[PDB]
Amino acid sequence: GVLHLDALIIGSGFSGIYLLHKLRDELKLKVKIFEAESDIGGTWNNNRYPGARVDCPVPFYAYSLPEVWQSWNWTELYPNQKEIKSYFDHVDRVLDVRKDCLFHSRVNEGTFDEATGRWTVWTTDGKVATAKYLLVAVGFASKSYLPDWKGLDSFKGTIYHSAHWPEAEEISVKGKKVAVIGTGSTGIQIFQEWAREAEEAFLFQRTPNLCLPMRQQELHAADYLAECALTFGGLEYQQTPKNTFDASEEEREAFWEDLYQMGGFRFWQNNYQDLLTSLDANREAYNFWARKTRARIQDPKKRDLLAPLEPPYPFGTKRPSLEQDFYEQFNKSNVHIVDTKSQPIVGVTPTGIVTADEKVHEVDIIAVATGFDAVTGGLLRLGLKDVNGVGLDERWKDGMSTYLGMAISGFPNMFLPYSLQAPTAFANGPTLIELQGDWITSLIRKMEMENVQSVTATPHAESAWNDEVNMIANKTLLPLTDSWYMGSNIPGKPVQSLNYLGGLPTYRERCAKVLDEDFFGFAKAHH
Ligand SMILES: Cc1cc2nc3c(=O)[nH]c(=O)nc-3n(C[C@H](O)[C@H](O)[C@H](O)COP(=O)(O)OP(=O)(O)OC[C@H]3O[C@@H](n4cnc5c(N)ncnc54)[C@H](O)[C@@H]3O)c2cc1C
């Protein structure tokens, strides 16, 4: 019948499984996960496209729970999706997670009743549950956008959409002419895999992606995870506490070559402290990146499209993609880069893709690598309502805001790990997830001990958080990056939410104040 719970968790990714564990095992609550799709792992169950791979190195892209890490070993510094999914299998063997998940349970309505202090939640297939706490751990959905190109139904080959990548069987590209449309991380990853094996490979690029070198390595069979957890982003390092132009030119060059050789996010998060605050410092860094990247590319036309001497946006204002041998692919004669800023795609024929200049690029297989939605899309389809009955879509039509990235005014007893206005895209996920999950767990403990029936962020605390978020961003180069333009003007590009850029140590202090000052920023109601 109707399922009644202490807490209901939506999603079985890193976030929701951590919460299940803390709320069920540590707090001894009655808890279930409603999960939309077939199995655990979140984005790692959902996004199985070729090349899918982490961007944070072992051992950071993992839980810090000793029972989990005890017996696990990783085969390489930056594991792939299949190996992440096998880690989730390990988590389930250790923590016993699957038996408290209901799969194929896509939430499509939530409403809160102030008199009882409980949510009532419905799935698309008709499941219905009630719960005191609602933990919305939906991450970032895929962007399910198929551009209105003419002639797609005439195409004689096949079109795959990284919003629903097949599984069952790998798509073989041997002997095939292929196209990737899109240059976010998804596009970069698919293209690297496919450019290696396809008979011919076209990447359709509107803006260049400023990719950093991964430096992959094979690996072999507590205090350290604790000290890294104290950094800006939760990686092993943070910014170098010096201004760019306080170093001489030669010192800069040698410092940047060291970063670039270590690889991964060193160049982004171990760089000079004014990388993201001074446009000139930023441009000097960029000029380095371009020099190194262009040196890898033999054809001058390809070089200027992939790594222009003038930057397309301030480097580091977005989470950079990583790459292994992407730029080298283009030195093959059958590997092409098509500039769709200049010559947009205007159509598909039976044999290929047609650009505005009427050039036909013949292919057998097309991957649409639209990449991820803003955080907004996925949360708005939940059909959540505030206590006055208003949909979150309507609440947010004029801009989205939150308290701490984790609560929304008028949605009581509802918490959002790994979501907007939180350190999210500027941090290591799992470290933020555990931080928010621990906090949510402590906040629930506190309510249960104090007999608090509901807590709801106040419009004031929300507006104040939004003002801190904005103020931190205003001091950086973020207002000058091209994301905002694209979201406001360009069809298919969703409006992004600002991350909190204050760093995990400040973010922690803001969270702690809630627990130490009597639910500071929330209105409370008692049982
Ligand atoms: C290829 C790739 C590589 C990445 N590597 C890194 C990295 O190295 N470092 C890092 O910091 N981040 C990384 N990320 C970002 C990654 O999203 C997060 O690290 C993290 O996995 C998010 O976990 P989550 O559980 O919050 O969200 P998700 O993993 O997205 O899980 C959300 C869950 O909610 C479910 N869901 C959505 N809607 C509903 C609904 N209506 N009802 C029921 N369930 C629903 C989804 O099906 C899903 O199972 C990577 C992302 C990808 C795609």
Coordinates of C-alpha atoms and ligand atoms in Angstrom, one line a residue:
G1 CA 0.0 0.0 0.0
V2 CA 1.1 3.5 0.8
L3 CA 4.7 3.5 2.2
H4 CA 5.3 5.6 5.2
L5 CA 8.9 6.5 6.1
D6 CA 11.0 8.8 8.3
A7 CA 13.0 9.9 5.3
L8 CA 12.7 9.6 1.6
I9 CA 15.7 10.0 -0.6
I10 CA 15.3 10.7 -4.4
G11 CA 18.3 9.2 -6.4
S12 CA 20.8 6.5 -5.8
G13 CA 24.1 8.2 -6.9
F14 CA 27.0 9.0 -4.7
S15 CA 24.8 11.5 -2.8
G16 CA 21.7 9.5 -2.1
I17 CA 23.6 6.3 -1.2
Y18 CA 25.7 8.3 1.3
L19 CA 22.5 9.6 2.8
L20 CA 20.9 6.2 2.9
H21 CA 23.8 4.9 4.9
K22 CA 24.0 7.8 7.3
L23 CA 20.2 8.0 8.0
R24 CA 19.5 4.3 8.1
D25 CA 22.7 3.1 9.8
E26 CA 23.8 5.9 11.9
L27 CA 20.4 7.5 12.8
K28 CA 18.3 4.3 12.7
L29 CA 15.6 5.9 10.7
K30 CA 13.2 4.2 8.4
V31 CA 14.4 5.3 4.9
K32 CA 14.2 4.3 1.3
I33 CA 15.6 5.6 -2.0
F34 CA 13.3 6.2 -4.9
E35 CA 15.4 5.9 -7.9
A36 CA 14.2 6.7 -11.4
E37 CA 16.2 4.2 -13.4
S38 CA 17.4 0.7 -13.2
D39 CA 20.3 0.6 -10.7
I40 CA 22.6 2.5 -8.4
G41 CA 25.5 4.8 -9.3
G42 CA 23.7 7.8 -10.5
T43 CA 25.3 9.5 -13.4
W44 CA 27.6 6.4 -13.6
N45 CA 24.6 4.2 -14.3
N46 CA 23.0 6.7 -16.5
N47 CA 25.9 8.1 -18.7
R48 CA 27.7 5.1 -20.2
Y49 CA 29.1 7.0 -23.4
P50 CA 32.4 6.0 -24.9
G51 CA 35.3 7.5 -23.0
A52 CA 33.4 8.5 -19.9
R53 CA 35.9 9.1 -17.2
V54 CA 36.6 10.9 -13.9
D55 CA 38.5 14.2 -13.6
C56 CA 39.6 13.9 -10.0
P57 CA 42.3 11.4 -9.3
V58 CA 42.5 8.5 -7.0
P59 CA 42.0 8.4 -4.1
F60 CA 39.7 11.5 -4.1
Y61 CA 36.9 10.3 -6.3
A62 CA 35.6 7.9 -3.7
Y63 CA 34.0 7.7 -0.3
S64 CA 36.2 8.2 2.7
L65 CA 34.3 5.5 4.6
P66 CA 37.0 3.1 5.9
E67 CA 34.8 0.0 5.4
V68 CA 34.6 0.9 1.8
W69 CA 38.1 1.9 1.0
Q70 CA 39.7 -1.0 3.0
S71 CA 39.4 -3.6 0.3
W72 CA 39.0 -1.7 -2.8
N73 CA 41.9 -1.0 -5.2
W74 CA 41.7 1.2 -8.3
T75 CA 43.5 0.1 -11.6
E76 CA 44.4 3.7 -12.6
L77 CA 44.6 7.3 -11.5
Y78 CA 41.5 8.3 -13.5
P79 CA 39.1 5.5 -13.8
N80 CA 36.5 5.0 -16.3
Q81 CA 32.7 4.6 -16.0
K82 CA 32.8 0.8 -16.0
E83 CA 35.2 0.9 -13.2
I84 CA 33.2 3.5 -11.2
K85 CA 30.1 1.3 -11.7
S86 CA 32.1 -1.7 -10.3
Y87 CA 32.9 0.5 -7.3
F88 CA 29.2 1.1 -6.7
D89 CA 28.8 -2.8 -6.8
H90 CA 31.5 -2.9 -4.0
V91 CA 29.6 -0.2 -2.0
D92 CA 26.5 -2.2 -2.2
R93 CA 28.3 -5.4 -1.0
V94 CA 29.8 -3.4 1.9
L95 CA 27.0 -1.2 2.9
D96 CA 23.9 -3.2 1.7
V97 CA 22.2 -0.5 -0.3
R98 CA 20.1 -2.1 -3.0
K99 CA 17.6 -3.7 -0.7
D100 CA 16.4 -0.2 0.4
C101 CA 16.2 1.2 -3.1
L102 CA 13.0 1.1 -5.2
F103 CA 14.1 1.2 -8.8
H104 CA 12.0 2.5 -11.8
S105 CA 10.5 5.0 -9.3
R106 CA 10.7 8.5 -10.9
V107 CA 9.3 11.1 -8.6
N108 CA 6.9 13.5 -10.3
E109 CA 5.1 15.2 -7.4
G110 CA 5.9 16.3 -3.8
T111 CA 3.7 18.3 -1.5
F112 CA 4.2 19.2 2.2
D113 CA 1.5 19.3 4.8
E114 CA 2.4 21.8 7.7
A115 CA -0.1 20.3 10.0
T116 CA 1.5 16.8 10.0
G117 CA 5.0 18.0 9.1
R118 CA 5.3 15.4 6.2
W119 CA 5.8 15.2 2.6
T120 CA 3.6 13.1 0.2
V121 CA 5.6 12.1 -2.9
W122 CA 4.3 10.3 -6.0
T123 CA 6.2 8.5 -8.9
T124 CA 5.2 8.4 -12.5
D125 CA 4.1 4.8 -12.3
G126 CA 1.8 5.6 -9.3
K127 CA 3.9 4.8 -6.2
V128 CA 3.1 7.0 -3.3
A129 CA 5.1 7.6 0.0
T130 CA 5.0 9.8 2.9
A131 CA 8.0 11.0 4.9
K132 CA 9.1 13.6 7.4
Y133 CA 12.4 14.4 5.5
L134 CA 12.8 14.7 1.8
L135 CA 16.4 14.4 0.5
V136 CA 16.5 15.5 -3.1
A137 CA 19.8 14.0 -4.5
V138 CA 19.2 14.3 -8.2
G139 CA 22.4 15.7 -9.2
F140 CA 22.4 17.3 -12.9
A141 CA 20.3 15.7 -15.5
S142 CA 21.2 15.2 -19.2
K143 CA 20.3 17.8 -21.5
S144 CA 17.7 16.0 -23.7
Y145 CA 17.8 18.5 -26.6
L146 CA 17.7 17.3 -30.3
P147 CA 18.2 20.5 -32.6
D148 CA 15.6 21.1 -35.3
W149 CA 17.9 20.2 -38.2
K150 CA 16.1 19.5 -41.5
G151 CA 16.4 16.1 -43.0
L152 CA 17.3 13.9 -39.9
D153 CA 14.7 11.5 -40.8
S154 CA 16.3 11.0 -44.2
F155 CA 19.8 10.1 -42.8
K156 CA 20.8 6.7 -43.7
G157 CA 23.0 5.9 -40.8
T158 CA 22.3 6.2 -37.0
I159 CA 22.2 9.1 -34.5
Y160 CA 23.1 8.5 -30.9
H161 CA 22.2 11.0 -28.2
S162 CA 24.5 11.1 -25.1
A163 CA 21.0 11.8 -23.2
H164 CA 20.3 8.0 -23.8
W165 CA 23.5 6.1 -24.9
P166 CA 22.9 2.4 -25.7
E167 CA 24.3 -0.4 -23.5
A168 CA 24.0 -4.0 -24.2
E169 CA 26.5 -3.6 -27.0
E170 CA 29.3 -1.2 -27.9
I171 CA 28.8 0.8 -31.0
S172 CA 31.7 -0.2 -33.3
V173 CA 33.3 2.6 -35.4
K174 CA 35.8 0.4 -37.3
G175 CA 35.4 1.1 -41.0
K176 CA 32.8 3.9 -40.3
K177 CA 32.8 7.7 -40.8
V178 CA 31.7 9.3 -37.6
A179 CA 30.7 12.9 -36.3
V180 CA 30.6 14.2 -32.7
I181 CA 28.5 17.3 -32.3
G182 CA 29.5 19.2 -29.2
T183 CA 32.8 20.0 -27.4
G184 CA 32.0 19.8 -23.7
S185 CA 33.7 16.9 -21.7
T186 CA 31.3 14.4 -23.2
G187 CA 32.2 15.4 -26.7
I188 CA 35.9 15.5 -26.0
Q189 CA 35.8 12.0 -24.4
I190 CA 33.7 10.4 -27.2
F191 CA 35.8 12.0 -29.9
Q192 CA 39.1 10.8 -28.4
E193 CA 37.8 7.3 -28.4
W194 CA 36.3 7.4 -31.8
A195 CA 39.0 9.4 -33.6
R196 CA 41.4 6.5 -32.8
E197 CA 39.5 3.8 -34.6
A198 CA 37.1 5.3 -37.1
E199 CA 37.8 5.3 -40.8
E200 CA 37.1 9.1 -40.7
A201 CA 36.0 11.4 -37.7
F202 CA 34.5 14.9 -37.7
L203 CA 34.2 17.1 -34.6
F204 CA 31.7 19.9 -34.9
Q205 CA 32.7 22.7 -32.7
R206 CA 31.1 26.0 -31.9
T207 CA 33.5 27.2 -29.2
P208 CA 36.8 25.7 -28.3
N209 CA 37.2 23.8 -25.0
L210 CA 40.2 24.8 -22.9
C211 CA 41.3 21.2 -22.0
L212 CA 44.0 20.4 -19.5
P213 CA 46.3 17.3 -19.8
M214 CA 45.2 14.3 -17.6
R215 CA 48.6 12.6 -17.1
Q216 CA 46.8 9.2 -16.6
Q217 CA 48.8 6.5 -14.7
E218 CA 48.2 2.8 -13.9
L219 CA 48.0 2.1 -10.2
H220 CA 48.8 -1.2 -8.4
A221 CA 47.6 -3.2 -5.5
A222 CA 42.7 8.4 6.9
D223 CA 45.0 11.4 7.9
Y224 CA 45.7 12.1 4.3
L225 CA 42.0 12.1 3.2
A226 CA 41.4 14.3 6.3
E227 CA 44.1 17.0 5.4
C228 CA 43.0 17.2 1.6
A229 CA 39.4 17.7 2.8
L230 CA 40.6 21.0 4.3
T231 CA 41.6 22.5 0.9
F232 CA 39.7 25.0 -1.3
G233 CA 38.2 22.3 -3.6
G234 CA 39.1 19.2 -1.6
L235 CA 41.9 18.2 -3.8
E236 CA 45.3 17.6 -2.5
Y237 CA 46.4 21.2 -3.2
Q238 CA 44.9 24.7 -3.6
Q239 CA 46.0 28.0 -4.9
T240 CA 49.6 29.2 -4.8
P241 CA 49.6 32.2 -2.5
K242 CA 51.5 34.5 -4.8
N243 CA 50.4 37.0 -7.5
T244 CA 51.2 36.2 -11.0
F245 CA 53.2 39.4 -11.7
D246 CA 55.2 39.2 -8.5
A247 CA 57.0 36.3 -10.2
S248 CA 59.4 37.0 -13.1
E249 CA 58.5 35.7 -16.5
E250 CA 61.0 32.9 -16.4
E251 CA 59.8 31.9 -12.9
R252 CA 56.2 31.8 -14.2
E253 CA 57.2 29.7 -17.2
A254 CA 58.9 27.1 -15.0
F255 CA 56.0 27.1 -12.4
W256 CA 53.4 26.6 -15.2
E257 CA 55.5 23.8 -16.9
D258 CA 55.6 22.0 -13.5
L259 CA 51.8 22.3 -13.1
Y260 CA 51.3 21.1 -16.7
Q261 CA 53.5 18.2 -16.2
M262 CA 51.8 17.1 -13.0
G263 CA 48.5 17.5 -14.9
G264 CA 45.0 17.1 -14.0
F265 CA 43.5 20.2 -12.2
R266 CA 47.0 21.6 -11.1
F267 CA 46.8 24.4 -13.7
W268 CA 43.3 25.3 -12.5
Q269 CA 43.5 25.0 -8.7
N270 CA 47.2 25.1 -7.8
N271 CA 47.9 28.3 -9.9
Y272 CA 48.6 31.9 -8.9
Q273 CA 46.1 33.3 -6.5
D274 CA 45.0 36.0 -8.9
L275 CA 44.4 33.6 -11.9
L276 CA 40.6 34.3 -11.6
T277 CA 40.7 37.8 -10.2
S278 CA 42.9 39.8 -12.6
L279 CA 42.2 39.7 -16.3
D280 CA 45.9 40.3 -17.2
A281 CA 47.1 37.5 -14.9
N282 CA 44.5 35.3 -16.4
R283 CA 45.5 36.1 -20.0
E284 CA 49.2 35.2 -19.2
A285 CA 48.2 31.8 -18.0
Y286 CA 46.0 31.4 -21.0
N287 CA 48.9 32.3 -23.3
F288 CA 50.9 29.5 -21.7
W289 CA 48.1 27.0 -22.3
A290 CA 47.7 28.1 -25.9
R291 CA 51.4 27.8 -26.5
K292 CA 51.6 24.2 -25.2
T293 CA 48.4 23.2 -26.9
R294 CA 49.2 24.7 -30.4
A295 CA 52.6 23.0 -30.3
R296 CA 50.8 19.7 -30.3
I297 CA 48.8 20.5 -33.5
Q298 CA 50.5 20.4 -36.9
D299 CA 47.9 22.1 -39.2
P300 CA 47.7 25.9 -38.7
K301 CA 43.9 26.0 -39.5
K302 CA 43.2 23.3 -36.9
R303 CA 45.4 25.0 -34.4
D304 CA 43.7 28.3 -34.6
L305 CA 40.2 26.6 -34.2
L306 CA 41.2 24.4 -31.3
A307 CA 43.6 26.8 -29.4
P308 CA 43.2 30.4 -30.6
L309 CA 45.8 33.0 -29.7
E310 CA 42.8 35.1 -28.3
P311 CA 41.0 33.3 -25.6
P312 CA 37.3 32.4 -26.1
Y313 CA 36.6 33.0 -22.4
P314 CA 38.7 33.5 -19.2
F315 CA 40.5 30.3 -18.5
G316 CA 39.3 28.6 -15.3
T317 CA 35.9 30.3 -15.1
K318 CA 34.4 26.9 -15.9
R319 CA 35.5 23.4 -14.7
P320 CA 38.0 22.5 -17.4
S321 CA 37.8 19.2 -19.3
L322 CA 40.7 16.9 -19.2
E323 CA 42.3 15.1 -22.1
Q324 CA 44.9 12.4 -22.9
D325 CA 45.6 12.5 -26.6
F326 CA 42.9 14.6 -28.0
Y327 CA 44.9 17.2 -29.8
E328 CA 47.1 14.6 -31.5
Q329 CA 44.2 13.0 -33.1
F330 CA 43.9 16.0 -35.3
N331 CA 47.3 15.3 -36.9
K332 CA 45.8 12.4 -38.8
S333 CA 44.6 13.1 -42.3
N334 CA 41.2 11.6 -41.7
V335 CA 40.4 13.5 -38.5
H336 CA 38.6 16.9 -39.0
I337 CA 37.4 19.9 -37.0
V338 CA 34.5 21.7 -38.3
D339 CA 33.8 25.3 -37.2
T340 CA 30.1 25.6 -36.7
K341 CA 30.3 29.2 -35.2
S342 CA 31.1 30.3 -38.8
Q343 CA 29.2 27.7 -40.7
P344 CA 26.3 26.2 -38.6
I345 CA 24.8 22.9 -39.3
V346 CA 21.7 23.6 -41.5
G347 CA 20.6 20.1 -42.3
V348 CA 21.3 16.3 -42.7
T349 CA 21.0 14.5 -46.0
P350 CA 21.0 10.7 -46.5
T351 CA 24.8 10.6 -46.5
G352 CA 25.8 13.4 -44.1
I353 CA 25.8 16.7 -42.4
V354 CA 25.3 19.9 -44.2
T355 CA 26.8 23.2 -43.0
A356 CA 25.6 26.8 -43.9
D357 CA 28.2 26.9 -46.6
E358 CA 26.5 24.0 -48.3
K359 CA 29.4 21.7 -47.6
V360 CA 28.3 18.0 -47.0
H361 CA 30.3 16.0 -44.5
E362 CA 29.7 12.4 -45.1
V363 CA 29.2 10.1 -42.2
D364 CA 27.5 6.9 -41.1
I365 CA 27.2 7.6 -37.3
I366 CA 26.4 10.9 -35.5
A367 CA 26.8 11.4 -31.7
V368 CA 25.0 14.3 -30.3
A369 CA 27.0 15.1 -27.2
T370 CA 24.7 17.8 -25.8
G371 CA 26.3 17.1 -22.4
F372 CA 24.5 18.1 -19.0
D373 CA 21.5 20.3 -18.2
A374 CA 21.9 23.2 -15.8
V375 CA 21.0 22.0 -12.3
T376 CA 17.6 23.4 -12.9
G377 CA 16.2 21.2 -15.4
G378 CA 16.2 18.0 -13.4
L379 CA 14.8 19.6 -10.2
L380 CA 12.0 21.3 -12.0
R381 CA 10.6 18.2 -13.3
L382 CA 10.2 16.7 -9.9
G383 CA 6.9 18.5 -9.4
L384 CA 7.8 19.7 -6.0
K385 CA 5.4 22.5 -4.4
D386 CA 6.1 24.9 -1.6
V387 CA 3.9 25.1 1.4
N388 CA 1.5 27.5 -0.4
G389 CA 1.1 25.1 -3.2
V390 CA 3.4 26.8 -5.7
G391 CA 5.7 24.8 -8.0
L392 CA 9.4 25.2 -7.8
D393 CA 9.3 26.1 -11.6
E394 CA 7.3 29.1 -10.8
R395 CA 9.3 30.0 -7.7
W396 CA 12.3 30.1 -9.9
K397 CA 11.1 31.8 -13.1
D398 CA 12.9 35.0 -12.2
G399 CA 16.1 33.5 -10.8
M400 CA 16.9 30.6 -8.6
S401 CA 18.0 30.9 -5.0
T402 CA 18.7 28.9 -2.0
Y403 CA 20.1 28.9 1.5
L404 CA 23.5 27.3 1.5
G405 CA 22.9 25.6 -1.8
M406 CA 20.9 23.0 0.2
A407 CA 17.5 24.5 1.2
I408 CA 14.8 26.5 -0.5
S409 CA 12.4 28.8 1.3
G410 CA 8.9 27.4 1.6
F411 CA 10.1 23.7 1.0
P412 CA 10.4 22.6 4.6
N413 CA 12.4 19.5 5.7
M414 CA 13.8 19.3 2.1
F415 CA 17.6 19.2 1.5
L416 CA 19.6 19.2 -1.8
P417 CA 23.1 17.8 -1.7
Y418 CA 25.4 18.5 -4.7
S419 CA 23.1 21.2 -6.2
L420 CA 23.1 25.0 -7.1
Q421 CA 24.9 27.7 -5.2
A422 CA 27.1 25.3 -3.5
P423 CA 30.8 24.6 -4.2
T424 CA 29.7 21.9 -6.7
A425 CA 31.5 22.5 -10.0
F426 CA 34.5 24.1 -8.2
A427 CA 35.1 21.2 -5.9
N428 CA 35.8 17.5 -5.7
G429 CA 32.2 16.0 -5.6
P430 CA 32.7 13.3 -3.1
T431 CA 34.3 15.6 -0.6
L432 CA 31.4 18.1 -0.9
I433 CA 28.9 15.3 -0.8
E434 CA 30.3 13.9 2.5
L435 CA 30.5 17.4 3.9
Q436 CA 26.8 18.1 3.0
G437 CA 25.7 14.6 3.9
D438 CA 27.3 14.8 7.3
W439 CA 25.6 18.2 7.8
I440 CA 22.2 17.0 6.8
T441 CA 22.6 14.0 9.1
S442 CA 23.6 16.2 12.0
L443 CA 20.7 18.6 11.3
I444 CA 18.3 15.7 11.3
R445 CA 19.7 14.3 14.5
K446 CA 19.3 17.7 16.1
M447 CA 15.7 18.0 15.0
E448 CA 14.8 14.6 16.3
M449 CA 16.5 15.3 19.6
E450 CA 14.9 18.7 19.9
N451 CA 11.5 17.5 18.8
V452 CA 11.5 19.9 15.8
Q453 CA 8.7 19.0 13.4
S454 CA 9.9 21.2 10.5
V455 CA 12.5 23.6 9.5
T456 CA 12.2 26.0 6.4
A457 CA 14.9 28.4 5.2
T458 CA 13.7 32.0 5.6
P459 CA 13.4 34.4 2.6
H460 CA 15.9 36.6 4.4
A461 CA 18.6 33.9 4.8
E462 CA 18.1 32.9 1.2
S463 CA 18.5 36.4 -0.1
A464 CA 21.5 36.9 2.1
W465 CA 23.2 33.6 0.7
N466 CA 22.4 34.7 -2.8
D467 CA 24.1 38.1 -2.0
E468 CA 27.3 36.3 -0.7
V469 CA 27.3 34.0 -3.7
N470 CA 27.1 37.0 -6.0
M471 CA 29.6 39.1 -4.1
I472 CA 32.2 36.4 -4.3
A473 CA 31.6 35.9 -7.9
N474 CA 31.6 39.7 -8.7
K475 CA 35.3 39.7 -7.6
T476 CA 36.3 37.1 -10.0
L477 CA 36.3 36.9 -13.8
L478 CA 33.1 34.9 -13.9
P479 CA 30.9 37.8 -15.0
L480 CA 33.1 37.9 -18.1
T481 CA 32.8 34.4 -19.2
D482 CA 30.5 33.5 -22.2
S483 CA 28.2 31.0 -20.2
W484 CA 25.8 33.8 -19.3
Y485 CA 25.4 35.0 -22.9
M486 CA 24.8 31.5 -24.2
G487 CA 22.1 30.7 -21.6
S488 CA 20.3 34.0 -22.2
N489 CA 20.4 33.9 -26.0
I490 CA 21.3 30.7 -27.6
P491 CA 18.7 27.9 -28.1
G492 CA 19.5 24.7 -26.4
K493 CA 21.9 26.3 -23.9
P494 CA 20.2 26.3 -20.5
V495 CA 20.6 29.2 -17.9
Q496 CA 23.3 28.2 -15.4
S497 CA 23.3 28.8 -11.7
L498 CA 26.2 30.3 -9.9
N499 CA 28.4 28.1 -7.8
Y500 CA 29.6 29.2 -4.4
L501 CA 33.3 30.2 -4.9
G502 CA 34.3 30.9 -1.3
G503 CA 36.0 27.5 -0.8
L504 CA 35.1 24.5 1.2
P505 CA 36.6 25.8 4.5
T506 CA 34.3 29.0 4.4
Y507 CA 31.4 26.9 3.1
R508 CA 31.9 24.6 6.2
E509 CA 31.8 27.6 8.6
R510 CA 28.5 28.8 7.1
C511 CA 27.0 25.3 7.5
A512 CA 28.2 24.9 11.0
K513 CA 26.6 28.1 12.1
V514 CA 23.2 26.4 11.5
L515 CA 24.0 23.6 13.9
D516 CA 25.7 25.8 16.6
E517 CA 23.2 28.8 16.6
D518 CA 19.9 27.1 16.9
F519 CA 19.1 26.5 13.2
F520 CA 20.4 29.9 12.2
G521 CA 18.5 30.9 8.9
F522 CA 15.6 28.5 9.4
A523 CA 12.1 29.0 10.8
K524 CA 11.3 26.1 13.1
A525 CA 7.9 24.5 14.0
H526 CA 7.7 21.9 16.9
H527 CA 5.9 18.6 17.3
Ligands
LIG1 C1 31.6 11.2 -16.9 C2 31.5 12.1 -15.6 C3 32.7 12.3 -14.9 C4 32.8 13.0 -13.7 N1 33.9 13.0 -12.9 C5 33.8 13.8 -11.8 C6 34.9 14.0 -10.9 O1 36.0 13.3 -11.2 N2 34.9 14.8 -9.9 C7 33.7 15.4 -9.5 O2 33.8 16.3 -8.5 N3 32.6 15.3 -10.2 C8 32.6 14.5 -11.3 N4 31.5 14.3 -12.1 C9 30.2 15.0 -11.7 C10 29.3 13.9 -11.0 O3 28.0 14.3 -11.3 C11 29.3 14.0 -9.4 O4 30.7 13.7 -9.0 C12 28.5 12.9 -8.7 O5 28.6 11.6 -9.2 C13 27.0 13.4 -8.4 O6 26.4 12.4 -7.6 P1 24.9 12.6 -7.1 O7 24.5 11.3 -6.5 O8 24.8 14.0 -6.5 O9 24.1 12.8 -8.5 P2 23.9 11.8 -9.7 O10 25.1 10.8 -9.8 O11 23.5 12.4 -10.9 O12 22.7 10.9 -9.3 C14 21.3 11.4 -9.3 C15 20.3 10.3 -9.3 O13 19.0 10.9 -9.2 C16 18.1 10.1 -10.1 N5 16.9 10.9 -10.5 C17 16.9 12.0 -11.2 N6 15.6 12.4 -11.2 C18 14.9 11.6 -10.4 C19 13.5 11.5 -10.1 N7 12.7 12.4 -10.6 N8 13.1 10.5 -9.3 C20 14.0 9.5 -8.9 N9 15.3 9.6 -9.1 C21 15.8 10.5 -10.0 C22 19.1 9.8 -11.3 O14 18.5 8.7 -12.1 C23 20.3 9.4 -10.6 O15 20.4 8.0 -10.3 C24 31.5 13.6 -13.2 C25 30.4 13.4 -14.1 C26 30.3 12.6 -15.1 C27 29.1 12.5 -16.0

